[model samples]
Target: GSMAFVKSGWLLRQSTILKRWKKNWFDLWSDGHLIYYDDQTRQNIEDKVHMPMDCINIRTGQECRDTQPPDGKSKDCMLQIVCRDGKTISLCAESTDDCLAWKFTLQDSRTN
Candidate 1:
């Protein structure tokens, strides 16, 4: 048997992260860090040196810093996730604490 493991603090690159984001809606900024775990692959923060610090556009595959302009209306940074079977789900997170995480499913809808 073989097993793959990725630590929590692996460095990620912005370019690689953006590419990963483009491929699928990966988790971002969970509990103040841009790192997550996937049953399919391993990703540690130490390996994510290029993880972009901004909002990513799932529809257009574009990554931006400000989801909205400065002093503009407040909008939540929509979180999304993709399963190993290629299914995408919108993760509705209310606050930073809402990102604590649970089972890898996007069917929960609530506010913090």
Candidate 2:
């Protein structure tokens, strides 16, 4: 009943600068802005990356094959948000079903 968004939860996102992984709380706004906070409590203020849904792309699995984690974990459940400005944010879901749910929602937001 409060702070209603299209989706909000914890996600392991990757950094574009050095491609490092970090866990953060993200909110997918109804207006199609994919914003991530500095922590899971959402208290700290951080940069919110606006996603151009209509021109962006979402991908699953290993994009470059060798780009998967070196720890031998399956990359099938991972998701990537490719923006129109040549910026790609890699994300990791909790599970395969959860991954599909996230992928589905983001894709709809982008299309709508």
Candidate 3:
């Protein structure tokens, strides 16, 4: 039995209830689950986000406005991963390449 991360990195994130900028460490699992902690460690359980992968919705820059996070985000880093079972965040990759890679990885896992 093996359990590991499919993709792991530090990415920018914003809350839904109350929006703000708070980059966190992420670990997207092969089991179709995503996990991130505000501080790389699970010590701060209060600031952790975890959910199963159901649907991946990358933002359209203005596609979503409800419970909107930070005002104006940069170009091409918005990754709005919308899990059908639960919610994560409207995240932004650390860089363009990072976002691209995430898109690719998600594509690999999302191709049904």
The lDDT leader among the candidates is 2
| Stretches of candidate 3 exceeding 4 Å from the true structure | 45-53, 59-73, 85-88
lDDT of 1 by residue, 1-112 (tens): 2322222321111223343222212333322223434322544322221122222222111222323311321223234333344433333233323333321222221110
TM-scores of the models, in the order given? 0.22, 0.78, 0.68
lDDT of each: 0.27, 0.71, 0.61
Rank order (by TM-score, best first):
2, 3, 1
Give lDDT tens digits, candidate 3, residues 19-82: 6767677777766556677667745532433333367454434454343444564556666766
* lDDT per residue as tens, model 2, 12-100: 77765556667778888877777788786778745565555433677877652224542444687688877677766777877777778
Q: Which residue ranges in model 2 land beyond 4 Å of their true spot?
A: 1-3, 52-55, 62-66, 70-72
Root-mean-square deviation (CA) per prediction: 13.9, 3.0, 3.6
**Span of ten consecutive residues with least summed lDDT in model 2:** 64-73
Give the clash total for candidate 1.
21
Model 1, residue 66: distance off in Å is 15
